[PDB]
Design a protein around this motif. Structure first.
Motif, PDB file in Angstrom:
ATOM      1  N   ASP A   1       0.859  -1.174   0.000  1.00  0.00           N
ATOM      2  CA  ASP A   1       0.000   0.000   0.000  1.00  0.00           C
ATOM      3  C   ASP A   1       0.901   1.231   0.000  1.00  0.00           C
TER       4      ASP A   1
ATOM      5  N   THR B   1      -0.516   5.872   2.593  1.00  0.00           N
ATOM      6  CA  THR B   1      -1.074   5.858   3.944  1.00  0.00           C
ATOM      7  C   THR B   1      -0.743   7.124   4.726  1.00  0.00           C
TER       8      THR B   1
ATOM      9  N   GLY C   1      -2.456   0.493  12.793  1.00  0.00           N
ATOM     10  CA  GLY C   1      -2.554   0.632  11.352  1.00  0.00           C
ATOM     11  C   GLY C   1      -1.877  -0.493  10.591  1.00  0.00           C
TER      12      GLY C   1
ATOM     13  N   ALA D   1      -3.367  -3.541   8.575  1.00  0.00           N
ATOM     14  CA  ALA D   1      -2.851  -3.730   7.227  1.00  0.00           C
ATOM     15  C   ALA D   1      -2.520  -5.206   7.009  1.00  0.00           C
TER      16      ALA D   1
ATOM     17  N   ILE E   1       4.020  -0.788   3.500  1.00  0.00           N
ATOM     18  CA  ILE E   1       3.297   0.452   3.305  1.00  0.00           C
ATOM     19  C   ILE E   1       4.293   1.575   3.108  1.00  0.00           C
TER      20      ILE E   1
ATOM     21  N   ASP F   1       4.249   5.497   3.870  1.00  0.00           N
ATOM     22  CA  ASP F   1       3.557   6.588   4.526  1.00  0.00           C
ATOM     23  C   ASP F   1       4.072   7.954   4.085  1.00  0.00           C
TER      24      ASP F   1
ATOM     25  N   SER G   1      -4.705   2.837  -0.627  1.00  0.00           N
ATOM     26  CA  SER G   1      -5.924   3.066   0.137  1.00  0.00           C
ATOM     27  C   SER G   1      -6.135   4.527   0.517  1.00  0.00           C
TER      28      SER G   1
ATOM     29  N   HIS H   1      -5.327   5.564   3.499  1.00  0.00           N
ATOM     30  CA  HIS H   1      -5.794   5.352   4.868  1.00  0.00           C
ATOM     31  C   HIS H   1      -5.507   6.581   5.746  1.00  0.00           C
TER      32      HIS H   1
ATOM     33  N   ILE I   1      -7.311   1.002   4.764  1.00  0.00           N
ATOM     34  CA  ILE I   1      -6.144   0.131   4.679  1.00  0.00           C
ATOM     35  C   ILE I   1      -6.383  -1.373   4.753  1.00  0.00           C
TER      36      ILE I   1
END
Ligand SMILES: [Mn+2]
Ligand SMILES: [Mn+2]
Length: 455
Positions: free
Chosen positions: A51, A54, A72, A76, A84, A86, A309, A311, A337
């Motif tokens: 992902d 985020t 988170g 996930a 992920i 971020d 996502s 998120h 997420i």
């Protein structure tokens, strides 16, 4: 050593039945014919999802996102996502390294899966441009985000955007943009409030499709003029994909990303009696349902290549609630997420919108490649990290706040019937989730240094 057997391995390109042998943190052998056994018969063995979008533990006014790097990443994992990336936010008068150090502290000792960082560029002054060379070379951050929206907060101008684009081509960085014309939205927003239109649904009406289309087009033209590479985050409408599709035909290095919410939800769910619509307040906003087909068609034929996502969760009660008086006070973002993969499999593959192999490419492989994490992540092959997901395609279930793992009081997909269930999840050879049970540990996840942009 771990021995996953009986399953059908599925990657961005292949689909075969065989066993995969894990030794330490990586895959060391695959084939047929003194190790930890794990049965994966009747299940798909796929690369852990990635992902690339985020906002864990992100501040907003005097409150913060419901999920932090711990809850988170745990959510996930349950969702089949093992990595992920971020967004590290910066502030004018910005020392890129201090903001970066701030983000590591947020993740350090909390993440249960591996994580990378994207760097927001608030302004492109001589100082920021100089620091940038160290962040790309030393900090392992090779993706920069520029906001074309959110006036007087994060919005950057064309000078900042263009300068960043030439710098990125020079240093080998990928430029990401949140594409919405910040100024037209600022005008339309104030206007709506002056006329007393304060319901959550006006959040969607104050930022028309054309505002995303205009911004998407502008960023692309600037990318072309700079001969750089661009990645448009969360593409929500036909107007934006059209611009992206056009640039792609010309051979320009322009890539696109979508999110589950724009693929399975539409504005009509925002028009609800009470304050219910506030649950779907995020930017860009949900669009008219016809746009979903265009997005799905674009993902099917390679016009858009990734699915993130975005998120950025806030509880309906206690947080989203701050905007009861007017939509501009509603914190933007949804809890997305956890269900990214499943809806992609259920709504995409099972409904014949995309093939099983594309399913893997759109949720893992292509993001790994665009953000410099391949072949370490994004696939199942000898030499790569043992980031594997054992997915049961035969399960039928309903998405609900009652059974999800995100630390939030609601799920935007509440009540949606879906196919597919994540059974086990391995992160660098270690179980994070085993048989629907969490067996990971806070702080197990590691920061991933990313390599420079490669086509
Ligand atoms: Mn955004
Ligand atoms: Mn975002």
């Amino acid at each position: 050593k771990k021995w996953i057997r009986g399953g059908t391995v599925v990657t961005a390109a292949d689909t075969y039945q065989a066993d995969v042998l894990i030794e330490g943190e990586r895959v060391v052998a695959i084939g047929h014919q003194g190790a930890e056994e794990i049965d994966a018969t009747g299940c798909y063995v796929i690369p852990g999802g990635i992902d690339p979008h985020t906002h864990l533990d992100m501040p907003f006014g005097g409150t913060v996102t419901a999920d932090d790097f711990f809850t988170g990443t745990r959510a996930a994992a349950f969702g089949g996502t093992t990595s992920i990336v971020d967004f590290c936010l910066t502030k004018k008068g910005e020392s890129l390294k201090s903001a970066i150090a701030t983000w590591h502290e947020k993740a350090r000792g909390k993440a249960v899966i591996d994580y990378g960082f994207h760097l927001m560029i608030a302004e492109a002054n001589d100082q920021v441009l100089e620091e940038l060379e160290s962040v790309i070379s030393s900090e392992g951050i090779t993706s920069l985000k520029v906001f074309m929206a959110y006036k007087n907060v994060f919005q950057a101008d064309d000078e900042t955007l263009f300068k960043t684009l030439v710098k990125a081509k020079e240093l080998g960085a990928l430029v990401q943009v949140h594409a919405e014309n910040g100024d037209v939205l600022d005008y339309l927003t104030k206007k709506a409030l002056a006329e007393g239109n304060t319901d959550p649904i006006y959040h969607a009406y104050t930022r028309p499709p054309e505002a995303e289309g205009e911004a998407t087009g502008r960023a692309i033209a600037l990318t072309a003029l700079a001969g750089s590479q661009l990645y448009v985050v969360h593409v929500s409408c036909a107007s934006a994909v059209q611009r992206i599709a056009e640039a792609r035909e010309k051979g320009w290095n322009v890539y696109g990303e979508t999110c589950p919410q724009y693929l399975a939800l539409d504005v009509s769910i925002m028009d609800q009696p009470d304050f219910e619509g506030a649950k779907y307040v995020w930017s860009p906003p949900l669009r008219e349902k016809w746009n979903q087909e265009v997005l799905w068609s674009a993902l099917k034929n390679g016009i858009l290549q990734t699915v993130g996502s975005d998120h950025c969760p806030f509880n309906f009660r206690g947080q989203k609630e701050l905007g009861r008086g007017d939509f501009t006070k509603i914190p933007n973002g949804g809890p997305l997420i956890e269900d990214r993969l499943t809806i992609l499999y259920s709504e995409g593959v099972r409904q014949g919108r995309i093939s099983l192999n594309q399913f893997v490419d759109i949720s893992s492989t292509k993001a790994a490649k665009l953000f410099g994490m391949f072949p370490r992540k994004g696939t199942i092959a000898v030499g790569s990290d043992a980031d594997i997901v054992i997915f049961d395609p035969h399960v039928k279930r309903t998405l609900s706040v009652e059974t999800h793992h995100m630390n939030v009081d609601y799920n935007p997909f509440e009540g949606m019937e879906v196919y597919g269930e994540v059974v086990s999840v391995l992160s660098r050879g270690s179980f994070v989730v085993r048989d629907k049970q969490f067996v990971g540990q806070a702080g197990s996840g590691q920061y991933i240094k990313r390599t420079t942009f490669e086509q």
